[PDB]
Amino acid sequence: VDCGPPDDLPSGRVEYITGPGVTTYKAVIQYSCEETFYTMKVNDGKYVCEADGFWTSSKGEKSLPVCEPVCGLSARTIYGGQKAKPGDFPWQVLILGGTTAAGALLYDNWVLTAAHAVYEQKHDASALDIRMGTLKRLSPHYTQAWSEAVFIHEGYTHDAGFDNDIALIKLNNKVVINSNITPICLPRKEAESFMRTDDIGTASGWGLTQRGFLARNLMYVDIPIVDHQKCTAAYEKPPYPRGSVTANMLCAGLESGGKDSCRGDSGGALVFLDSETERWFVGGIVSWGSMNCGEAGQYGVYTKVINYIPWIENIISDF
Numbered sequence: 001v002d003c004g005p006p007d008d009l010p011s012g013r014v015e016y017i018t019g020p021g022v023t024t025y026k027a028v029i030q031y032s033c034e035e036t037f038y039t040m041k042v043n044d045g046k047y048v049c050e051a052d053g054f055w056t057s058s059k060g061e062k063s064l065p066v067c068e069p070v071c072g073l074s075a076r077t078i079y080g081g082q083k084a085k086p087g088d089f090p091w092q093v094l095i096l097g098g099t100t101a102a103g104a105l106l107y108d109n110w111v112l113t114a115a116h117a118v119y120e121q122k123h124d125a126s127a128l129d130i131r132m133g134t135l136k137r138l139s140p141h142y143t144q145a146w147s148e149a150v151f152i153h154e155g156y157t158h159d160a161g162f163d164n165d166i167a168l169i170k171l172n173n174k175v176v177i178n179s180n181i182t183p184i185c186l187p188r189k190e191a192e193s194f195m196r197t198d199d200i201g202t203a204s205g206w207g208l209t210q211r212g213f214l215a216r217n218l219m220y221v222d223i224p225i226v227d228h229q230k231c232t233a234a235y236e237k238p239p240y241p242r243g244s245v246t247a248n249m250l251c252a253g254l255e256s257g258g259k260d261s262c263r264g265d266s267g268g269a270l271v272f273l274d275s276e277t278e279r280w281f282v283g284g285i286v287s288w289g290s291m292n293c294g295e296a297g298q299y300g301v302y303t304k305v306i307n308y309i310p311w312i313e314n315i316i317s318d319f
């Protein structure tokens with residue numbers, strides 16, 4: 001007859017509609033989210049106490065709704081690039097603790113990165129120093145986060161190629177999503193239509209520039225997708241082993257070499273704009289390339305994220 005008080009909604013609130021503390025049969029409550037930066041999923045938030053003794057929704061679901069963070073926003077919509085303005089890459093994440101590397105925020109508690117960037121520190125059983133909300137790499141003003149768990153892809157072989165160079169970091173606390181910090185969208189099934197050859201993607205990071213030192217400020221380059229055969233043939237020579245460019249990788253860069261990502265950009269998100277939803281999504285992860293960055297005819301190689309959606313949805317749902 002009495003459902004008790006309702007459960008708190010993460011990134012959302014609860015309101016008694018019938019009255020304050022009215023929890024009896026047919027008592028009406030409303031869930032909601034901060035609709036600016038979160039969006040309710042599952043149901044409309046209207047929940048009624050039913051005869052089976054628990055809060056139940058319009059669709060007949062007895063579990064909470066989900067406040068999913070808004071993704072893919074940008075103020076726009078590294079060799080040879082330009083400085084990123086604030087809000088350009090709000091998903092950008094710096095990862096310290098070993099050497100300098102990067103990731104990309106997914107939701108408010110997950111960071112997509114390269115397995116090669118975080119392999120050494122996970123296997124030392126040390127939490128990752130994760131920072132975001134800042135364009136300057138060495139600034140003391142930043143949003144702090146820490147790793148709860150690190151999930152490296154089970155087909156990744158460290159220092160033995162870069163196939164399945166993908167990893168997920170679970171943040172031990174949720175990040176506050178604002179105009180400065182916003183996750184990147186995961187690609188939908190038809191997102192390959194925005195990733196054909198010669199389609200433009202943007203890589204961003206703090207890695208080496210043409211001057212040969214790490215950048216103090218976040219930089220970025222627009223670069224086009226390269227034909228896969230053209231990229232496989234580009235790396236079919238020593239010192240590279242046979243089969244270095246796999247089907248789980250896309251390549252991006254110029255024949256002339258003027259634009260690339262380098263050391264220190266590892267794990268960053270190579271992103272593409274969905275012109276219909278008007279939202280940026282992650283197409284690639286910064287993985288590898290030639291040792292001499294910006295080398296002509298030596299394209300940057302990126303982990304093909306759309307191949308790893310079932311792996312991503314496995315871990316994020318199950319953990």
Ligand SMILES: Nc1nc2c(CC(=O)Nc3ccc(Cc4ccncc4)cc3)cccc2[nH]1
Pocket residue numbers: 160161162240241244260261262263264265266286287288289290291292293294299300301
């Ligand atoms: N342009 C470019 N350089 C990059 C580097 C530096 C880098 O990764 N250098 C490297 C080159 C070759 C190998 C050998 C190898 C073995 C098997 N399969 C592929 C390659 C290893 C590392 C890091 C991150 C992004 C990069 N963007």
